[PDB]
Design an enzyme around this catalytic site. Structure first.
Site, short mmCIF file in Angstrom:
data_model
loop_
_atom_site.label_atom_id
_atom_site.label_comp_id
_atom_site.label_asym_id
_atom_site.label_seq_id
_atom_site.Cartn_x
_atom_site.Cartn_y
_atom_site.Cartn_z
N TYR A 107 3.87 -3.81 -1.88
CA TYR A 107 5.20 -3.38 -2.28
C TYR A 107 6.15 -3.48 -1.11
CZ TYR A 107 4.82 1.22 0.06
OH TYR A 107 4.70 2.23 0.99
N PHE A 153 13.31 0.21 3.71
CA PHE A 153 12.84 1.41 4.38
C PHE A 153 11.33 1.56 4.38
CE2 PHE A 153 13.43 2.52 -0.05
CZ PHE A 153 12.30 3.25 -0.35
N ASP A 154 10.59 0.73 3.64
CA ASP A 154 9.14 0.85 3.57
C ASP A 154 8.57 -0.42 2.95
OD1 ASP A 154 6.62 1.97 3.91
OD2 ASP A 154 6.68 3.12 2.05
N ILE A 162 6.19 8.56 -6.53
CA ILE A 162 7.34 9.05 -7.28
C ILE A 162 7.12 8.79 -8.76
CG2 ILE A 162 9.20 9.07 -5.59
CD1 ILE A 162 9.75 6.18 -6.24
N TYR A 202 13.52 10.48 -4.98
CA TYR A 202 13.65 11.57 -4.03
C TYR A 202 14.79 12.54 -4.34
CZ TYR A 202 10.12 8.87 -1.81
OH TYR A 202 8.93 8.23 -1.53
N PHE A 237 12.22 -1.36 -5.74
CA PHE A 237 10.88 -1.67 -5.27
C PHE A 237 10.45 -3.03 -5.83
CE2 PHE A 237 10.94 2.89 -4.52
CZ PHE A 237 10.17 3.05 -3.38
#
Length: 108
Positions: free
Chosen positions: A27, A37-38, A57, A83, A100
């Protein structure tokens, strides 16, 4: 809104994750502006989580269950499925919509 799933490349179209199975994915996670961010791909290690245990999530719990094994998909996740108002300090801002890019490699 909830989670939108937009296909990137098709899977087998037959095998969908069920509650209790482990989803093995690569991912990449980005803010709505496109900032990353990830990413599991940057760490060269797939990410594993058990569907239904709320280890991810809500948008992942409902979005990934809609993917077939081998599919790559774009999940756009509103803050309520993510979030929320709080966000995550210094990573995810308040009230953030996340995007994502997710590939479902296999189930265990």
């Amino acid at each position: 809104m909830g989670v939108q799933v937009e296909t990137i490349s098709p899977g087998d179209g037959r095998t969908f994750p069920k509650r209790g199975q482990t989803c093995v994915v690569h991912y990449t996670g980005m803010l709505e502006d496109g900032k990353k961010f990830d990413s599991s791909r940057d760490r060269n290690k797939p990410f594993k989580f058990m569907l239904g245990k709320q280890e991810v999530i809500r948008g992942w719990e409902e979005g990934v269950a809609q993917m077939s094994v081998g599919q790559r998909a774009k999940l756009t996740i509103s803050p309520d499925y993510a979030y929320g108002a709080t966000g995550h300090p210094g990573i995810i801002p308040p009230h953030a919509t996340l995007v994502f890019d997710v590939e479902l490699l296999k189930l265990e």
